[PDB]
Design a protein around this ligand. Sequence first.
Ligand SMILES: [Mn+2]
Ligand SMILES: [Mn+2]
Ligand SMILES: [Mn+2]
Ligand SMILES: [Mn+2]
Ligand SMILES: [Mn+2]
Ligand SMILES: [Mn+2]
Lengths: 587, 587
Amino acid sequence: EPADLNDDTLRARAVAAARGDQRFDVLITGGTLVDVVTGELRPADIGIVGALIASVHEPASRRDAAQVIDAGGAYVSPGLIDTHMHIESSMITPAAYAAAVVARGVTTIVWDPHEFGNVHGVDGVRWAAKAIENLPLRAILLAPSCVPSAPGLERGGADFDAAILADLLSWPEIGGIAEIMNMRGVIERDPRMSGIVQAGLAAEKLVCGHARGLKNADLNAFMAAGVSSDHELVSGEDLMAKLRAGLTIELRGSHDHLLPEFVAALNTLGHLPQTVTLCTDDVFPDDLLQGGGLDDVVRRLVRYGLKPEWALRAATLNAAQRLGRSDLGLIAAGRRADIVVFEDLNGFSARHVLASGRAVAEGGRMLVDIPTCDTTVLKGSMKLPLRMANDFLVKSQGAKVRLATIDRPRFTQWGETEADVKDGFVVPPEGATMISVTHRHGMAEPTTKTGFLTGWGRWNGAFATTVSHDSHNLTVFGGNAGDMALAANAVIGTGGGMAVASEGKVTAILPLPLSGLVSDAPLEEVARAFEDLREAVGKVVEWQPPYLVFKACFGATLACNIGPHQTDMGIADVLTGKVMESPVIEV
Amino acid sequence: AEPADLNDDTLRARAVAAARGDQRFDVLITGGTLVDVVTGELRPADIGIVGALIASVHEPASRRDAAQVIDAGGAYVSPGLIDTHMHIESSMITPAAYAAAVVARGVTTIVWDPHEFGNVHGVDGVRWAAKAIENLPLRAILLAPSCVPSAPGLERGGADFDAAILADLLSWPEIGGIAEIMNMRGVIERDPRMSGIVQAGLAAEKLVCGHARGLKNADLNAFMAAGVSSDHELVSGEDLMAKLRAGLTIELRGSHDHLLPEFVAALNTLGHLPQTVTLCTDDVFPDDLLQGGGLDDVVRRLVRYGLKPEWALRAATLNAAQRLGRSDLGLIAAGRRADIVVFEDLNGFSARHVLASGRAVAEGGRMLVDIPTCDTTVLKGSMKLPLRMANDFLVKSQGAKVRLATIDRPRFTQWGETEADVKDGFVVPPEGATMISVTHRHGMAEPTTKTGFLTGWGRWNGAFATTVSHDSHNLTVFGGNAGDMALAANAVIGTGGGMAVASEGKVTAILPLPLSGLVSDAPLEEVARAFEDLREAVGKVVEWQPPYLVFKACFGATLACNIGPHQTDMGIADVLTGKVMESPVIE
Ligand SMILES: [Mn+2]
Ligand SMILES: [Mn+2]
Ligand SMILES: [Mn+2]
Ligand SMILES: [Mn+2]
Ligand SMILES: [Mn+2]
Ligand SMILES: [Mn+2]
């Protein structure tokens, strides 16, 4: 690709059909074309020969095709393109991800496999490549750039230097470097991050960014280095600033409450900037099943008042432009027939989906087989023995200690509190929730490291997860050691996943036997298990939106973020490079 | 070597350090209102530049930090202009002199199809083009001439390009794709030669640029199914709308002043600037270049006719950079190339400053740097034929009376027939008829002057000889008498090529074009001034009737690929039948 489009026999045939001398393979008839260049909705029929669109012409003027697809009463769009996403967050395999989003009209994704990368390293990125190769969904890979996210502060399953990055950039499956979240290293010209960027520039592929909270001087410096896109948009003003700065915007639907501000900001401008694309970022399996993938970013934007023509152009032509793929994103003679027929421009229900000229879905149902990929290398990734309640408690000598605390959910700061000591162990003080992290990849000693969170409500029980961005070590939150050991051991035994315990019983398990990140069960089952897990965790603790929510359970160990975080090494501070081994300050 | 030149480690470290505030900029542009071509806003900003890079776009007056400060106070800051389809040869001057004119007006990149030198000298001509642009402050991306000669077997130029030659040209790093394919029919009909040429463009993965004059509907679909992806030949506002709907890159040209109203209306009515619209000059005479002059004048005229400055500049910068796959161009943003023009306002587009790759190249309409010239040797000596005589211009026949074929009407050529007396040994030019005599002048054939009889060209009390005659450029002479035709013809032969007027036994004006017969090595001032006088002298010989019976018609009468009869160096050509009439005498 796109040399498959350029075959002489296929071109002669596409041209002869366009001419009216040969029939199409496929005619899409009676539809209204979403013309993503002019923004018009206009009747046209579509003539397709093999993987090419051969003609865009007057309704009902041709009737000669091997196959006719009825778009009467409906709308014809280029298939949708997601510019930034992670299959792993949906908790299923790439084949199951494909069956879900292709039936919804998604024909191209840009997949940063950094979760698999942190677990299995380069073999992770290889599995991802293998797994996409014969899907009806095109998947362009990005090379994970920050593994682990904070070198020297945490240990995942892998470590990627400038050389590993250059080697991944050499792969034809890899379309650039995946979101660079070590912003300081780029801006301050740290050797490792700078070597990675330089590799990205030397390969002449995309260098994708994570620019959360970057403003003014810092952003100019992030872009001067070569970082050229961002999805970490925190507000309508942030969007405008980032547009003005000249970044390609990867507009995500994963923070839904921000979509109305994005819409108001763009409507105030009066035109959709050609640098705006859409992406899903990280979609949970229940939201994937019920809402959708990239199609739901289109649907939600429109729901919030963005013209369906702007939503679609962002999801098609602008994204193809970003990707340098002038075969994609546009229903035009000479382009690839990745096409979706939508019942209307509010529900975006896909009546038909073609990928490279072949009908692959109808009415929400796959019409073709999706090849699976052997998952063996992903199994057996929990490499630690079962935990003891005492794994969760902190040893100390005296009878009263000063304790460092990790203060506030999400916007973390150093705290301090007091605690009694009994039986050689510290006594979980009032207002504190334990966070315990254990290296589970076998690259380090499996020693449970426990910290004391503050501002996380009162936990009556525990939650264990093997999804824990980005090191994905075994991570347990709890109100008492006993329930933390039940939850931990349940996910160890299933080979990874999530579990809730309360009052000496395990109340919910979601098995994620692949890498501790995903499951091979069908989406419907993973979705339902996830809702039940959310139900069960809800009985353990009262959420206080926003910030003190369930999702915060997967981000507490993300060591590259500002402020203290508990990791599998201790409490980490990226600003100093200091890992605190024990939380006991004194006594 | 671009854009790897931007990617050097020590340059990027310095750009990053400067953006951060730890090191100074090499250049600051201060006080200006930035034209943000992404957002469509005119918004105050200052610009910081390191080496070839824009290192920073920041709050006005926040940095004073620079090796040189360039003042934009009271003015507008824009990306340098990009011209997506043009021919230096039309302006009758060298690429160095063209560079001097347009650089000083803020045009920093041109896309040049050198098919005039190509038809005259073949590959050596394309080769001389690449050499001459090498170290100009003007970037020029070359396109490979696609149609040489324009209509094989109907005319003879100085060269013949098949698919193998195209494939060779396409491997040059200087070549950005295939130049305007004007043999539309050979593409639509899958002619073997045209098809191999296109297939060679698809195989190189470079641009395939079109000429799609009068193509509609099925024929337009076929031309694009072949892979042709841009056009500049827009015949109306509705043709503009239909080519935009069809998904072509538009090369919106100013070479046809009278359509601009239609184009502006169709775009204003649409209500946004589609991102596929770019601007081009196509063919600019030296007087228009000098008074006008280049891609700046296309912005300037569109604005004056009612296009928003913001759209005109977007088309001139970002949209072209996207078409060209050059994400270092077309936008003032940190991490892109510092090609920048500062405009006094958005009505005059007067260029206060111009920078190229971070270097101030022009100020106040004057060049600040040396423009290197190129050895013109290969272009000399291109008139390969003996002097003409009266008799070269008369048609030898046998009877007393004769049925004569005529070429009726200028521009919209159509077959005619008239009666003519034969005085002595030659046809006597019938009343209302003007001679067109064309002689092969490249030495690929005998220099036999081939004579036809035009109708609808006024009455000629004299002759005009030209060695510029699209696209084969043979010696082309128009006139009412043979002695005046001889003299005009021999004048331009004697100078090595050019244009001359003769009337009543006297040459009234001569413009030498000793370089290929197409251009001169004299300053633009002189060429422009000679060209005006030449126009004045020809006005004395025949009375024009706009449009159509105009002086420019004299340079398009032999273009054989156009529908309708045309005198060529071989006889009367007709691309509809594939036939050459060697004598105008039917009977
Ligand atoms: Mn991110
Ligand atoms: Mn992400
Ligand atoms: Mn992650
Ligand atoms: Mn043309
Ligand atoms: Mn042209
Ligand atoms: Mn020409």
